[PDB]
Design a protein around this ligand. Structure first.
Ligand code: A1IMY
Ligand code: A1IMY
Ligand code: CL
Lengths: 303, 302
């Protein structure tokens, strides 16, 4: 038993991480097959950069790419949105089975924080409703990646590009499209007002009941419309029928209907915790998806 | 900036995990060079779990009784030895993925990364602290035993924990990689209980320093304290004593923030007296004790 914030095993991604140096800027790149993916702001020397014009002036030899103590030869460069693609002479022999996916707000992934192309640590993040992540990133962290594992397949969903003034983080998918209304430029930008990921809070309350924490359960049920009136008032994301459907398994297992669990959450929002905890937390946690709870409580493995 | 419960990258440990089967019992083993380390209770039967004579059970075992699997490859056991509560299975093939490694016995308050495994395959990685009562707050299901706790210094894996048991309060106990249990626990089904747990005071102070480095000062105050006056208050909230060693260890974080250790001790004293009053620190409504001074410096300073 027990319940922890659990990251995916990072080994398949560790063997893809390289160092990319251009001018004075060093950051990380992702080496898959014969291409290194990294943030395009590596070329910058910043208020209003013309990325296409700056890239035309670059040659292949301007990009120093190192896999450990081995220099890779760049034989081509191209920009895809906010991501630079450096074609190299060698295919990565450690390339895992992979694909590029775009995640939706409320989805979780594992971040492999890297410095100088060397993996430093791994942690679990949720894409916030305001399209930021609450990461942990120092100088040289950019090009660190976020992923999920399904069977033997790494799904890359995030590359790290920037920190906003409130100390939260923003980046792109591996096709270089920003999550949220951000640009890779030194100009005034702010994270929007954030909201709580309601479906994830319910999943975590189900996790609490599976681990024998039940003091918040009650006799009452609510309706989706009445719950959503309360959700709106407390800066919670609307609960949809899709969310109710996805919580179906945990509803069946615990014998607590989703709208019955919604009646518990409604009371917690109105009345607070009353000095009590849930799974060692004095607040409602929203960075576990229904699937995160099932895979941790079932012991799904990755080979 | 930012502050997260951060594990070490698990790849160097993933390449060491194997499956070990004896009879109907399957658990995990750690394959380093030509030795597989696993919990000795793999040799136990359901009849004899209250009072197993491990020496007597092991002499009865043949090498072919031990089914060891690395992916889709059976390893041949050519020798076995028991060191304390750990079984060392000598195999014919050395692990080509063996990293640079050390075995270290850690002290209470020390943190490490757990690679939770089933059937020799990794499920996930998370951070744990060795609690003052010599338990860890893990996440472990049937077949999790032989999962290891580790830290990585540069390219070198320090193995500090092997998972052996769950206590009736749902917390976890295990051994170092020489097979010595942390705490008074034994690998037997006989009634055992964790002692009363206490909060790792030096770790709470490290975390308050992390909060200041991340630009939060709301909990600070104008007061100082003596070490003995701090300890008399902390004890009443079931906090571990703060020693001069702990004050010395917090020296670097004190230098960076310009907050004297005994000044930060006065802030924690007030937080214990008042609570947080609808505020959070680093996204938490409680005082977090599972970050060491060392964890804070590597995450906040590089
Ligand atoms: C990648 N290495 C860095 C981000 C890391 C470094 C640190 C410590 C600030 N936190 C990180 O996550 N990426 C950047 O620094 C990016 C690049 C280069 C400069 C600028 C624009 C960019 F996207 F091209 N940038 C930022 O992160 C700036 C963005 C400003 C928009 C309003 C903030 N961030 C900052 O300057 C700061 F200090 F607010 F975080
Ligand atoms: C390793 N696979 C398991 C422990 C995992 C399985 C689960 C779900 C209980 N949680 C885990 O972390 N190890 C054991 O089961 C050990 C072995 C075999 C039986 C017994 C003694 C042992 F150490 F040799 N054991 C236990 O974990 C028992 C210990 C009892 C003494 C007081 C409890 N635990 C339990 O029976 C229980 F239910 F409390 F967790
Ligand atoms: Cl230690």
């Amino acid at each position: 038993s027990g319940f922890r914030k659990m990251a995916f095993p990072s080994g398949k991604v560790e063997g893809c991480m390289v160092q990319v140096t251009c001018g004075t800027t060093t950051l990380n790149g992702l080496w898959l097959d014969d291409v290194v993916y990294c943030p395009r702001h590596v070329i910058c020397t910043m208020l209003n950069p013309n990325y296409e014009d700056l890239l035309i002036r670059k040659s292949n030899h301007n990009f120093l790419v190192q896999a450990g103590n081995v220099q890779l030869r760049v034989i081509g460069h191209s920009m895809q949105n906010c991501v630079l693609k450096l074609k190299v002479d060698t295919a990565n022999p450690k390339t895992p089975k992979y694909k590029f996916v775009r995640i939706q707000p409320g989805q979780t992934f594992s971040v492999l924080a890297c410095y100088n192309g060397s993996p430093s640590g791994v942690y679990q993040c949720a894409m916030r409703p305001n399209f930021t992540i609450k990461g942990s990133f120092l100088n040289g962290s950019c090009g660190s990646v976020g992923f999920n594992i399904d069977y033997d397949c790494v799904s890359f969903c995030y590359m790290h590009h920037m920190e906003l003034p409130t100390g939260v983080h923003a980046g792109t998918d591996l096709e270089g499209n920003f999550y949220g209304p951000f640009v890779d430029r030194q100009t005034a930008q702010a994270a929007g007002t954030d909201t709580t990921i309601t479906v994830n809070v319910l999943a975590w309350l189900y996790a609490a009941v599976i681990n024998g924490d039940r003091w918040f359960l009650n006799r009452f049920t609510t309706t989706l419309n009445d719950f959503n009136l309360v959700a709106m008032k407390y800066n919670y994301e609307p609960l949809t029928q899709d969310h109710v459907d996805i919580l179906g398994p945990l509803s069946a297992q615990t014998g607590i209907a989703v709208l019955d669990m919604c009646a518990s959450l409604k009371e917690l929002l109105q009345n607070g915790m009353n000095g009590r905890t849930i799974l060692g937390s004095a607040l409602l946690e929203d960075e576990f998806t229904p699937f995160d709870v099932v895979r941790q409580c079932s012991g799904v493995t990755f080979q």
